[PDB]
């Protein structure tokens, strides 16, 4: 569930969120951040289990 949530947030984050005379603003690192969070949680779940 957390893996899906983080992947969904990463994908929803790459779309641009500033517009007008200024463009872009999306977080290019979001996919690596989500992969880092899900790997971070993996050690915690393996400890609990």
């Amino acid at each position: 569930a957390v893996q899906a949530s983080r992947l969904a947030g990463a994908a929803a984050d790459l779309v641009p969120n500033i517009f007008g005379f200024a463009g872009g603003g999306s977080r290019w690192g979001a996919i690596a951040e989500a992969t880092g969070y899900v790997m971070e949680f993996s050690a915690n779940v393996m400890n609990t289990e």
Binding site: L14, P16, F19, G20, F21, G23, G24, I31
Partner: protein, 43 residues
């Protein structure tokens, strides 16, 4: 995170490698819409 699923594996020096082409797109209005691309090949 490839552009248009431009990913292609390769074996180099007997090790598995991945090439994919990312595109970062940026757009804004100026009415006319401008666009910037920066194509970035990752290995």
């Amino acid at each position: 995170n490839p552009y248009k699923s431009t990913i292609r594996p390769v074996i180099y020096k007997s090790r598995l490698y991945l090439l994919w082409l990312e595109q970062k797109e940026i757009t804004w209005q100026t009415y006319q819409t401008e666009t910037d691309y920066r194509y970035e090949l990752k290995l």
